[PDB]
CSV table of N, CA and C in Angstrom, one decimal:
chain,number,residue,atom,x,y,z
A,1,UNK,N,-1.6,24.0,-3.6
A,1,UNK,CA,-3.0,24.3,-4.1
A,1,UNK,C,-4.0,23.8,-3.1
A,2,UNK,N,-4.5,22.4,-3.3
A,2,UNK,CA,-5.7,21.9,-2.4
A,2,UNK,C,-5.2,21.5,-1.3
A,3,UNK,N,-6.2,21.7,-0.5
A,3,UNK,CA,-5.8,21.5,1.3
A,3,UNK,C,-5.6,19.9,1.3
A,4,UNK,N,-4.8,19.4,2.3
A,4,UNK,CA,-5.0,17.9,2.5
A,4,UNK,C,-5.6,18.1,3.8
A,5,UNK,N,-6.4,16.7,4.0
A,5,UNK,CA,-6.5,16.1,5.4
A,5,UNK,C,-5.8,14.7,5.8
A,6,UNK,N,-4.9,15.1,6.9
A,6,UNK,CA,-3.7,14.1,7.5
A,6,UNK,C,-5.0,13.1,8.2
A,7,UNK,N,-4.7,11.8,7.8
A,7,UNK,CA,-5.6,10.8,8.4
A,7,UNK,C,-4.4,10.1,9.9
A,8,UNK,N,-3.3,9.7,9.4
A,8,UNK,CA,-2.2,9.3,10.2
A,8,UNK,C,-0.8,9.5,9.4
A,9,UNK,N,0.0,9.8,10.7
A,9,UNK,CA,1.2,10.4,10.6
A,9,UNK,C,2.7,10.5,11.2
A,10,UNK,N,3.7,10.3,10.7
A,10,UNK,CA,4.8,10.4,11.8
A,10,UNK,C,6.4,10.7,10.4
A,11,UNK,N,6.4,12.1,10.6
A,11,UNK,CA,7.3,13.1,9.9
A,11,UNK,C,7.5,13.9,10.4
A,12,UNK,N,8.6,14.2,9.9
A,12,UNK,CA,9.2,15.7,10.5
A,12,UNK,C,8.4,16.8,9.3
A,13,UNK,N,7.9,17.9,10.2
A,13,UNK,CA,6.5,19.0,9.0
A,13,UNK,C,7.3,19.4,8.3
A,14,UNK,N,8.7,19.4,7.8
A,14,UNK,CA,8.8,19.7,6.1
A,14,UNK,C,8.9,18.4,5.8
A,15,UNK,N,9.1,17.5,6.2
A,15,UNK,CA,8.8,16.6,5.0
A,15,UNK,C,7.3,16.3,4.8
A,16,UNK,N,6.5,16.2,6.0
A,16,UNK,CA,5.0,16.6,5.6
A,16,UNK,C,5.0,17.3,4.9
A,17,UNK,N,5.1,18.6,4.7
A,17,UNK,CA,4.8,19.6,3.8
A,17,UNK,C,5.0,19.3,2.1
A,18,UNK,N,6.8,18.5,1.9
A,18,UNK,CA,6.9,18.5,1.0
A,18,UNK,C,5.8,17.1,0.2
A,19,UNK,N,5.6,16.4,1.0
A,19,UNK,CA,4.7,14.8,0.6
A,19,UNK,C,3.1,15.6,0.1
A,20,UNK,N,2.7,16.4,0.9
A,20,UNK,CA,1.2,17.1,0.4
A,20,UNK,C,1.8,17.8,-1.0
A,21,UNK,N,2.5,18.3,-1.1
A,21,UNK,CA,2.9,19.3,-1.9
A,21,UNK,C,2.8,18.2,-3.5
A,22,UNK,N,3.8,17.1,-3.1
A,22,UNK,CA,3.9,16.2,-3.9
A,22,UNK,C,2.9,15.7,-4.6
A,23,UNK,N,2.0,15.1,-3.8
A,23,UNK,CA,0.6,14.4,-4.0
A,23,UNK,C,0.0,15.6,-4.9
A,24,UNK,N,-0.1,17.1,-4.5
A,24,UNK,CA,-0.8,17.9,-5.4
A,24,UNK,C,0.0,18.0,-6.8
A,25,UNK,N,0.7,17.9,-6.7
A,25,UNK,CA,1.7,18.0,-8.4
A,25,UNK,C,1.2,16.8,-9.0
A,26,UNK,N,0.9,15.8,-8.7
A,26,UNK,CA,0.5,14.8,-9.3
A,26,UNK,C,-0.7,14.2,-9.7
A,27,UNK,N,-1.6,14.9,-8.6
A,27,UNK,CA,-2.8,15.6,-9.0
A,27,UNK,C,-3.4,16.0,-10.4
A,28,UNK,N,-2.6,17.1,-10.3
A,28,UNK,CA,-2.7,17.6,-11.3
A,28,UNK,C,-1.7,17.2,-13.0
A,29,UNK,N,-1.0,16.4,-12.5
A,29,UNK,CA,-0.1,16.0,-13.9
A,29,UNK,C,-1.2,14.5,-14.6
A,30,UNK,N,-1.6,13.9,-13.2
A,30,UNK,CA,-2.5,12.7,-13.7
A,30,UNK,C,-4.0,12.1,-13.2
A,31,UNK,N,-4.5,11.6,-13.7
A,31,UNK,CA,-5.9,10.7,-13.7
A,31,UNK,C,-5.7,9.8,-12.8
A,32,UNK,N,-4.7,8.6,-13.3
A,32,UNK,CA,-4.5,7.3,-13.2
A,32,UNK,C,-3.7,7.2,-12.4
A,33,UNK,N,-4.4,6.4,-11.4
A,33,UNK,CA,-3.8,6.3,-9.6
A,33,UNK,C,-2.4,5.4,-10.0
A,34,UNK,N,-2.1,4.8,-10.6
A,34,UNK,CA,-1.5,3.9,-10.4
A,34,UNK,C,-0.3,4.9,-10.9
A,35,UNK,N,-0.2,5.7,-11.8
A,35,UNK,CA,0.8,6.8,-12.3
A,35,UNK,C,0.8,8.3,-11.2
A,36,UNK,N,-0.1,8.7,-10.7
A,36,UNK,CA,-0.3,9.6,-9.4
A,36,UNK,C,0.9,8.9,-8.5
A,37,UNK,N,0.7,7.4,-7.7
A,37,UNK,CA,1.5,7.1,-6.7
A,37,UNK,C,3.0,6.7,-7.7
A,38,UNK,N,3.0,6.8,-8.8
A,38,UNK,CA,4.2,6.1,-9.3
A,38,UNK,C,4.9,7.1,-9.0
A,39,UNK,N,4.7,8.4,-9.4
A,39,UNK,CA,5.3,10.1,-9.7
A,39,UNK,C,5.7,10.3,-8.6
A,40,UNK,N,4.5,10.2,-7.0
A,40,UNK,CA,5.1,10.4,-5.5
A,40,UNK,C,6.2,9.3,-5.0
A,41,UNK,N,5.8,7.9,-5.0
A,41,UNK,CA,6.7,7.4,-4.9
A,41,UNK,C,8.8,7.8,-5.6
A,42,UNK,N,8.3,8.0,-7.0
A,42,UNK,CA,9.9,8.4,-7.5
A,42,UNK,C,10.5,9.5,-7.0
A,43,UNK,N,9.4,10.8,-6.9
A,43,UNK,CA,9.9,12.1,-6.5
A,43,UNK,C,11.0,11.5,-4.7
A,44,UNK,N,9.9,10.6,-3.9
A,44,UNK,CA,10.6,10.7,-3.0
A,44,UNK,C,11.6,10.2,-2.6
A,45,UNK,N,11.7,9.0,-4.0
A,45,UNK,CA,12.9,8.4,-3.9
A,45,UNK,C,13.9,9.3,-4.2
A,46,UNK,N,13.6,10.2,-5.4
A,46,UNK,CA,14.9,10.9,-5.6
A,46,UNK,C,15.6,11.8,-4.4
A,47,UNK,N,14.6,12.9,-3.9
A,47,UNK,CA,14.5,13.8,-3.1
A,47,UNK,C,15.1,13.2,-1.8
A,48,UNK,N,14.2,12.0,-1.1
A,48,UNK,CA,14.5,11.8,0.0
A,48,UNK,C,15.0,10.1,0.3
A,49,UNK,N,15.8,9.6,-0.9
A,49,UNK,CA,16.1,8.7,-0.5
A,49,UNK,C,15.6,7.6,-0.8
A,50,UNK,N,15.8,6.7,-1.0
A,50,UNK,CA,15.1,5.3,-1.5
A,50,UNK,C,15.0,4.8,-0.1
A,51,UNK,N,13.8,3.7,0.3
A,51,UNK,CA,13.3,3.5,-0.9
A,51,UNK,C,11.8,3.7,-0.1
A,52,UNK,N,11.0,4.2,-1.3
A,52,UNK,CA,9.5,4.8,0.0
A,52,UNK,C,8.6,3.9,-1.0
A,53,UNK,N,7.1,3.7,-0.6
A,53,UNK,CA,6.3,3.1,-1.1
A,53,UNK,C,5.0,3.5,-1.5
A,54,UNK,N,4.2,4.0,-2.5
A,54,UNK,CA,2.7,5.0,-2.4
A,54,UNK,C,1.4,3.9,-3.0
A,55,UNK,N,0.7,4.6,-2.6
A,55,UNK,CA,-0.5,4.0,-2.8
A,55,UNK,C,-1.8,5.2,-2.9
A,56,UNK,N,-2.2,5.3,-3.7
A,56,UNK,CA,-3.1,6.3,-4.2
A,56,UNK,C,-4.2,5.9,-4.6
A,57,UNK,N,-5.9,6.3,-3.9
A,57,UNK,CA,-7.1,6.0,-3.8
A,57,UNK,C,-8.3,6.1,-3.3
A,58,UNK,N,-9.3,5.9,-3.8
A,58,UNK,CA,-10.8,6.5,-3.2
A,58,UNK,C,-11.2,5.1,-2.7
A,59,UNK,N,-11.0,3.8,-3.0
A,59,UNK,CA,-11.0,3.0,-1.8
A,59,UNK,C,-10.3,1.9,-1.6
A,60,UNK,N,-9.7,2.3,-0.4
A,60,UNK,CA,-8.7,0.8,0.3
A,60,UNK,C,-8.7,1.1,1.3
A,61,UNK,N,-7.8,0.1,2.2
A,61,UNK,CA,-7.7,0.1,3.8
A,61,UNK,C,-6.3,-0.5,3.7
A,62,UNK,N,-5.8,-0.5,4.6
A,62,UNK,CA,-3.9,-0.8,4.4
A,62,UNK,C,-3.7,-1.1,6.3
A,63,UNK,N,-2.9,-2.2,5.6
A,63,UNK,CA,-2.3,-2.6,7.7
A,63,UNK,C,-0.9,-2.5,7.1
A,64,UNK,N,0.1,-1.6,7.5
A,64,UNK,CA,1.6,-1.2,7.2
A,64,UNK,C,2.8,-1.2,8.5
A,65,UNK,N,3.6,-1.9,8.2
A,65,UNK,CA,5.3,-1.5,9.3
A,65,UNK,C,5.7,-0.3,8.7
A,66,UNK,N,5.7,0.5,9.0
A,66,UNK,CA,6.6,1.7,8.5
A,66,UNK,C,7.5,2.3,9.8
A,67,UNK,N,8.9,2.7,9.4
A,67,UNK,CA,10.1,3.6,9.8
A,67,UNK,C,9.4,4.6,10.4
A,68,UNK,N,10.0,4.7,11.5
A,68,UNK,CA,9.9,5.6,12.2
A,68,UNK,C,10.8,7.1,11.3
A,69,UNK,N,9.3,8.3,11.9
A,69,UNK,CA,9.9,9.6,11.5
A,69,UNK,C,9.6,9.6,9.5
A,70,UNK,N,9.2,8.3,8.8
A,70,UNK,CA,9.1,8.3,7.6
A,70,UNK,C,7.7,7.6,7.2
A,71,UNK,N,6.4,8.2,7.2
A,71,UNK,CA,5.0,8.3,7.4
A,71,UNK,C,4.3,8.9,6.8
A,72,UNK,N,3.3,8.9,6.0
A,72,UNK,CA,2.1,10.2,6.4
A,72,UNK,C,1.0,9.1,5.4
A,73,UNK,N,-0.1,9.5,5.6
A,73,UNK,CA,-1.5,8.8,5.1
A,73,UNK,C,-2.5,10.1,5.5
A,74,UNK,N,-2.4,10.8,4.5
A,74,UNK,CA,-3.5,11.9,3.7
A,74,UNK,C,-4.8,12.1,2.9
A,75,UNK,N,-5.7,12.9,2.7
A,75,UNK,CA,-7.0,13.1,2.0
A,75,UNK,C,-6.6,14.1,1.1
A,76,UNK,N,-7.0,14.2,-0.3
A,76,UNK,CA,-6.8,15.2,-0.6
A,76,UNK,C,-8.1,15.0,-1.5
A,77,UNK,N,-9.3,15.8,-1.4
A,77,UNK,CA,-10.6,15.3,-1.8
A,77,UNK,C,-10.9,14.2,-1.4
A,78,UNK,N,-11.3,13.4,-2.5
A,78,UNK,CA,-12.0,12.3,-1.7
A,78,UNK,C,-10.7,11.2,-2.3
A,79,UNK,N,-9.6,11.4,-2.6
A,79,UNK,CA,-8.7,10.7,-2.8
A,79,UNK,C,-7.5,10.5,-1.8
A,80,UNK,N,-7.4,9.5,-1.3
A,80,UNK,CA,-6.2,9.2,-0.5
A,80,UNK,C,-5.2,8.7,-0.7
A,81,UNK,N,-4.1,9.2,0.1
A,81,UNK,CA,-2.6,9.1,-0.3
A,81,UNK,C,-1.2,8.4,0.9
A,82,UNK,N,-1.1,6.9,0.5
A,82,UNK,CA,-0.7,6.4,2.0
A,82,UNK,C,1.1,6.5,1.2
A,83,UNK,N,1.8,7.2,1.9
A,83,UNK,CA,3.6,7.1,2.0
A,83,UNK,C,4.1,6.7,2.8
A,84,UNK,N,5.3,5.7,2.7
A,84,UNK,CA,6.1,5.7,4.0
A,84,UNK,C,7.4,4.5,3.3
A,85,UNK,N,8.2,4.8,4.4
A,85,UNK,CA,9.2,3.5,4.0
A,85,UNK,C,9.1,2.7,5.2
A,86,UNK,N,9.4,1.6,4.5
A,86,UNK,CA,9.7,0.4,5.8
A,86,UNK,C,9.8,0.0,6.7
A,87,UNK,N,9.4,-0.4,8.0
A,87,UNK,CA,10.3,-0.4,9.1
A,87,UNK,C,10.9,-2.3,8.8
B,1,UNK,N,-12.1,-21.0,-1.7
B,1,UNK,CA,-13.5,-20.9,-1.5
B,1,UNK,C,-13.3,-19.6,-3.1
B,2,UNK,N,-13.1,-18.9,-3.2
B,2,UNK,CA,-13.5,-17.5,-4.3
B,2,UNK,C,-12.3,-18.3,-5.3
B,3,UNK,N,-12.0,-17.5,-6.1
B,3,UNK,CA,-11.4,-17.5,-7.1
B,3,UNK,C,-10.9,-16.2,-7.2
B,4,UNK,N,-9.5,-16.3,-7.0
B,4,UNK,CA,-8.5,-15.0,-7.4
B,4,UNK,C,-8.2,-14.9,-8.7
B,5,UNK,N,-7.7,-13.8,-9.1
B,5,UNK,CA,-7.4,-13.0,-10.4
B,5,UNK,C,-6.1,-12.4,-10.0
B,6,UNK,N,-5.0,-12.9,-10.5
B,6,UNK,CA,-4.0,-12.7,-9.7
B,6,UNK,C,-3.4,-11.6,-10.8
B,7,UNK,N,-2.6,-10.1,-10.4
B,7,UNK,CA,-2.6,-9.2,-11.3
B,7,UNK,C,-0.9,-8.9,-11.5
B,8,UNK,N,-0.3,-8.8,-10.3
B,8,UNK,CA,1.3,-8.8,-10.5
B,8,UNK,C,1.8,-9.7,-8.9
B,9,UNK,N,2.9,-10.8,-9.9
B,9,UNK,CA,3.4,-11.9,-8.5
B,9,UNK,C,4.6,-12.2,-8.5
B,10,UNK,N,4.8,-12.6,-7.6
B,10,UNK,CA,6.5,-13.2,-7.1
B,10,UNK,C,6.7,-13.6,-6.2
B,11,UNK,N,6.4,-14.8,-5.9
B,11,UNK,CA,6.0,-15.8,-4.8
B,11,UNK,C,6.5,-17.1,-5.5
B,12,UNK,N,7.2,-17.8,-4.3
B,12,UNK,CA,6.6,-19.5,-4.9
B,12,UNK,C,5.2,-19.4,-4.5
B,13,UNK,N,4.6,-20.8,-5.2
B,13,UNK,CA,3.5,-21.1,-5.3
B,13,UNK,C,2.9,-21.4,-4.5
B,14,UNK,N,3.6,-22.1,-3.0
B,14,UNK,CA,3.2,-22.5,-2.0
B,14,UNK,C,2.7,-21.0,-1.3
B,15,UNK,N,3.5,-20.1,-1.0
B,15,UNK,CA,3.5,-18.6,-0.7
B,15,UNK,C,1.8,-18.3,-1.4
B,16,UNK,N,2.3,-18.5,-2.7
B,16,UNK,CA,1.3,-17.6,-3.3
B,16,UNK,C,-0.4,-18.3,-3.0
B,17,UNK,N,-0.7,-19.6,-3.3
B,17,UNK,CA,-1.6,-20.2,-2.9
B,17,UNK,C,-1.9,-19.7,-1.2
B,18,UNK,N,-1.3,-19.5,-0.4
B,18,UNK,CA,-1.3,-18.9,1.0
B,18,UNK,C,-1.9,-17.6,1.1
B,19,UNK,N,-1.4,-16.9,0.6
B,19,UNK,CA,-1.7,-15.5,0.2
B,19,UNK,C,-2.9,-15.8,0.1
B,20,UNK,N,-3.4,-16.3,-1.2
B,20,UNK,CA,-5.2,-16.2,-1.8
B,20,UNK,C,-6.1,-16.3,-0.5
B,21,UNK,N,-5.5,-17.4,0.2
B,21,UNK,CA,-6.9,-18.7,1.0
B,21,UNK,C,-6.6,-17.6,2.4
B,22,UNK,N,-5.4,-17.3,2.6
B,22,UNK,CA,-5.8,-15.8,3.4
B,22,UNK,C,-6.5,-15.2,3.5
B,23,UNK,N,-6.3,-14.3,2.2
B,23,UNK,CA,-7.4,-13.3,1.9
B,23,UNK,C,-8.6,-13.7,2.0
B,24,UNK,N,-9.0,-14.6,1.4
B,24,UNK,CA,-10.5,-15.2,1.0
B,24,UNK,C,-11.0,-15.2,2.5
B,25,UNK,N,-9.6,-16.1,3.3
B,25,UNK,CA,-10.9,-16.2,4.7
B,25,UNK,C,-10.5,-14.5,5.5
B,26,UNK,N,-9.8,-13.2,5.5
B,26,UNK,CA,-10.1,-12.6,6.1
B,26,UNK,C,-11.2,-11.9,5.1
B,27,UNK,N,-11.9,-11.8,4.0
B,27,UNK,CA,-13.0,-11.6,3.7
B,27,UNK,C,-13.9,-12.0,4.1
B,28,UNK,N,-14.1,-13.8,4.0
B,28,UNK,CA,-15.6,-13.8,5.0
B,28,UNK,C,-15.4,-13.9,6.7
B,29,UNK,N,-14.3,-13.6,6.9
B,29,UNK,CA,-13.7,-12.6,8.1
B,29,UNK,C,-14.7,-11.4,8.9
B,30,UNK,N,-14.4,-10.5,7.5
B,30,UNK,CA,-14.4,-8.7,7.7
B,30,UNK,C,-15.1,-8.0,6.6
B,31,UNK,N,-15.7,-6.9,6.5
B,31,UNK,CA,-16.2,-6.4,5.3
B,31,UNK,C,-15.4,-5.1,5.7
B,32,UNK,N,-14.7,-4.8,6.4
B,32,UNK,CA,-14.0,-3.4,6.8
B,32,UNK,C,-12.7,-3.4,6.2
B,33,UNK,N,-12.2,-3.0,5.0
B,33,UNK,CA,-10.9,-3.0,4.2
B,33,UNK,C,-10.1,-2.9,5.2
B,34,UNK,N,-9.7,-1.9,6.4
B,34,UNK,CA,-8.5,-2.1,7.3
B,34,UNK,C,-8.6,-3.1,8.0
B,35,UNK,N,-9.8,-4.0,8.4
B,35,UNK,CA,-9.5,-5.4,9.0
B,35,UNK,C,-8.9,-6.4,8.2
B,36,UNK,N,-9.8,-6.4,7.0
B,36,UNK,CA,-9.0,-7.2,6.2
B,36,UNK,C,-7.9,-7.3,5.6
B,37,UNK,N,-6.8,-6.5,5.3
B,37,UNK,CA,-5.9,-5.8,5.5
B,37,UNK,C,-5.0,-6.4,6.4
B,38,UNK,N,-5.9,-6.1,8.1
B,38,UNK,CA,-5.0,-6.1,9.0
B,38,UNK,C,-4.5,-7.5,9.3
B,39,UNK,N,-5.7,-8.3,9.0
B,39,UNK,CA,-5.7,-9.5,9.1
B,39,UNK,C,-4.8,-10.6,8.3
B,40,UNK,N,-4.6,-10.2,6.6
B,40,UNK,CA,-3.8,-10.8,5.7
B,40,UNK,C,-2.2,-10.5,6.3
B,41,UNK,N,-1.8,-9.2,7.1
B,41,UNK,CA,-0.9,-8.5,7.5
B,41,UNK,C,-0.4,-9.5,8.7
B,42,UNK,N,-0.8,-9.4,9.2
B,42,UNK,CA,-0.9,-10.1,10.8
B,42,UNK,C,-0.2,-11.7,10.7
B,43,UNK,N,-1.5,-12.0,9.7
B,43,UNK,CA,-1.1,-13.8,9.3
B,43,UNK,C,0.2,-14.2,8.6
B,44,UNK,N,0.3,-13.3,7.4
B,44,UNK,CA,1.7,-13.5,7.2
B,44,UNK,C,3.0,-13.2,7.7
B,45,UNK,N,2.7,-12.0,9.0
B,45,UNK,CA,4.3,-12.1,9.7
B,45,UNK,C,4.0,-12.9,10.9
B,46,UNK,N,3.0,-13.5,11.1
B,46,UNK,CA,3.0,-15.3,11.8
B,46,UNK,C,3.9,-15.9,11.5
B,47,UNK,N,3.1,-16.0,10.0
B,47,UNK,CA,3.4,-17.4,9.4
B,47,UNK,C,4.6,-18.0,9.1
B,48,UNK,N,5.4,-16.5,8.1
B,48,UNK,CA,6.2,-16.2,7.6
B,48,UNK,C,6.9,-15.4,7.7
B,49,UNK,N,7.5,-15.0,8.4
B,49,UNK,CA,8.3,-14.0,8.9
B,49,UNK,C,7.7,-12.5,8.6
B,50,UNK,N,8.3,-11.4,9.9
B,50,UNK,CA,8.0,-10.0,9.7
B,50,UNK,C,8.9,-9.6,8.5
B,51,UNK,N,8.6,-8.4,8.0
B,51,UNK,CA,7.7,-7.6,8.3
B,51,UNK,C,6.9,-7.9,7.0
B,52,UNK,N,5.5,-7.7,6.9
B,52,UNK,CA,4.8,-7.4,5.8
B,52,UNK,C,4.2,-6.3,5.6
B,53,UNK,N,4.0,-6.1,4.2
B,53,UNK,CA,2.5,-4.8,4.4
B,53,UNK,C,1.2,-5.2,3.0
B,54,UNK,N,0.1,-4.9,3.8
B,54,UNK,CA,-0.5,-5.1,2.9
B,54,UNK,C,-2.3,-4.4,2.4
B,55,UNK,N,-2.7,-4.2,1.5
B,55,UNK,CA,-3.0,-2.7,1.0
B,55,UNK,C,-4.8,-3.9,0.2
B,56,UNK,N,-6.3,-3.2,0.6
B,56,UNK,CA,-7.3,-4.3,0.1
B,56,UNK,C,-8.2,-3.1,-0.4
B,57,UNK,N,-8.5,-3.2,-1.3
B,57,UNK,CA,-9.6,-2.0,-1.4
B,57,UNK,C,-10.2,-2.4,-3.3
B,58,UNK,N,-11.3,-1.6,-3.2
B,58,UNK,CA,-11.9,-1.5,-5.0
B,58,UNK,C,-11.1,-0.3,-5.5
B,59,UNK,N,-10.8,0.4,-5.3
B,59,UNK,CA,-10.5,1.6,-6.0
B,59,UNK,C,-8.5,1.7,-5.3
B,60,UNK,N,-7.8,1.8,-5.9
B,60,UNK,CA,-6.7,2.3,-5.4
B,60,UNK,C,-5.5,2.2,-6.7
B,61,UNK,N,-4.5,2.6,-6.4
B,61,UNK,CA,-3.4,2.3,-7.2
B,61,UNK,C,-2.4,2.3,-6.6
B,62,UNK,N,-1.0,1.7,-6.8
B,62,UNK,CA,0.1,1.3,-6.1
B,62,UNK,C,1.1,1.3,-6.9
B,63,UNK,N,2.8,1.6,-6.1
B,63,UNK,CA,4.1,1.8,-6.5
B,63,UNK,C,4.7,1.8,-5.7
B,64,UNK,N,4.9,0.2,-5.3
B,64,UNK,CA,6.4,-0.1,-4.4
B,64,UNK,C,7.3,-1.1,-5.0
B,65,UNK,N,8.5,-0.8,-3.9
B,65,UNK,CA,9.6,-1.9,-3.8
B,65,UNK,C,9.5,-2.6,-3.4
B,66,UNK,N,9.5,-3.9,-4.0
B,66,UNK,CA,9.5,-5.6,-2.9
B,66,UNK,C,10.7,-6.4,-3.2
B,67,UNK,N,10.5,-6.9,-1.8
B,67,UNK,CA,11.7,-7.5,-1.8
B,67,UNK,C,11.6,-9.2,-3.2
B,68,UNK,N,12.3,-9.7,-3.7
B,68,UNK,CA,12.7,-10.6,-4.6
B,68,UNK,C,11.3,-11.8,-4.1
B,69,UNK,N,10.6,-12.3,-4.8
B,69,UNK,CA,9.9,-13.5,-4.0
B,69,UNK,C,9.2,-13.4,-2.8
B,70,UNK,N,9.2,-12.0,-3.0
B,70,UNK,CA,7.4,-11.6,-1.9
B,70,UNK,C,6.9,-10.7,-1.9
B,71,UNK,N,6.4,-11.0,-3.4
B,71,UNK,CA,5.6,-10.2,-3.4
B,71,UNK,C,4.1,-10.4,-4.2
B,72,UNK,N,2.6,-10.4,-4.3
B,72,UNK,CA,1.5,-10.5,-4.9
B,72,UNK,C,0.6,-9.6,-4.9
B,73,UNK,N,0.2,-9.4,-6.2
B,73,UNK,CA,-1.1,-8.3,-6.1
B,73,UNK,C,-2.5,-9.3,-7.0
B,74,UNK,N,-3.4,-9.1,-6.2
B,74,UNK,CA,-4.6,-10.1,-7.0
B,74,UNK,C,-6.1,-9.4,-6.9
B,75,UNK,N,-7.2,-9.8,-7.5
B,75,UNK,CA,-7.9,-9.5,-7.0
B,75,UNK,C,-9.2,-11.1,-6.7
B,76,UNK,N,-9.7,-10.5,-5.8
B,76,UNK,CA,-11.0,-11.3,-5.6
B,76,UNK,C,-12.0,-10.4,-5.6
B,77,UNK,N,-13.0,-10.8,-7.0
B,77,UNK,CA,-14.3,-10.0,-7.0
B,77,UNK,C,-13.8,-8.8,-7.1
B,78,UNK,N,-14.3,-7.4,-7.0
B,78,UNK,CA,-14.1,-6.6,-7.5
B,78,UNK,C,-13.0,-6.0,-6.4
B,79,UNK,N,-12.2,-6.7,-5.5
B,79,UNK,CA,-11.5,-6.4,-4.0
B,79,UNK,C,-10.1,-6.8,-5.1
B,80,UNK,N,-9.3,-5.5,-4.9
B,80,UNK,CA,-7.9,-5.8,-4.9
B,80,UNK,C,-7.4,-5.9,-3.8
B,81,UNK,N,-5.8,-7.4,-3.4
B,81,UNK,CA,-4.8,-7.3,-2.6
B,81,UNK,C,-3.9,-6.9,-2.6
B,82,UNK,N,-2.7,-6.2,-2.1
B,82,UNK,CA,-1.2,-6.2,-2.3
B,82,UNK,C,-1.0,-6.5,-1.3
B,83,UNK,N,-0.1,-7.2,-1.2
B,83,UNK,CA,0.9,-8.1,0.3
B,83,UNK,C,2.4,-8.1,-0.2
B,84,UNK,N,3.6,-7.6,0.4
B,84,UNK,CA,4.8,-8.0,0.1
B,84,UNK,C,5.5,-7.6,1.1
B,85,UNK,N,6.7,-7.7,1.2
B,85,UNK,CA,7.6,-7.3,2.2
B,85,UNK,C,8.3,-6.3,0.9
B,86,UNK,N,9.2,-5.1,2.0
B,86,UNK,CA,9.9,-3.8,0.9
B,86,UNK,C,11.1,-4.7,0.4
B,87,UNK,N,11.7,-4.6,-0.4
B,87,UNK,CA,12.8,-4.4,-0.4
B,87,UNK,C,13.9,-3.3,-0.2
């Protein structure tokens, strides 16, 4: 449904694809950020593996080590959406 | 110097008391959430070993995995922290 804007990034574009996709399902199932990233974070544990980490919000700033190839930090309105696992 | 409000922890004390006086001084540091951020990030894989990540803002929500004993989320003033390493 809603366009995102990629702020920073390092995935292979379907898993981009699938992570925006994600964030919009959750969107729309919730309000409350802390339940928004709970939903993204599980989906992508299930889907792609444990173990990934989300953070969902209109304001923060984040200094992150993340895995290479397992990334993305997106807009989707004025809400932002930082994924990734570990490095 | 502030007074933290500490929201979810798993630190020794010593850790965790470090964490705060961190933050506090990359606040009167920075007023730019990714500095401060970058700065709490930075200090702790100094201090205390890589890797950390860590996440400062008024508005946000969060859902990760940490590793056993490092992990804290607080706020000072209306500024939330997260700092941990994944597990």
């Amino acid at each position: 449904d809603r366009k995102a804007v990629i702020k920073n990034a390092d995935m292979p574009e379907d898993l981009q694809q699938d992570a925006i996709d994600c964030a919009n399902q959750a969107l729309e199932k919730y309000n409350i950020e802390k339940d928004i990233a709970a939903f993204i974070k599980k989906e992508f544990d299930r889907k792609h593996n444990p173990t990934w980490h989300c953070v969902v919000g209109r304001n923060f700033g984040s200094y992150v080590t993340h895995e290479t190839h397992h990334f993305i930090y997106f807009y989707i309105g004025q809400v932002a959406v930082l994924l990734f696992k570990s490095g």
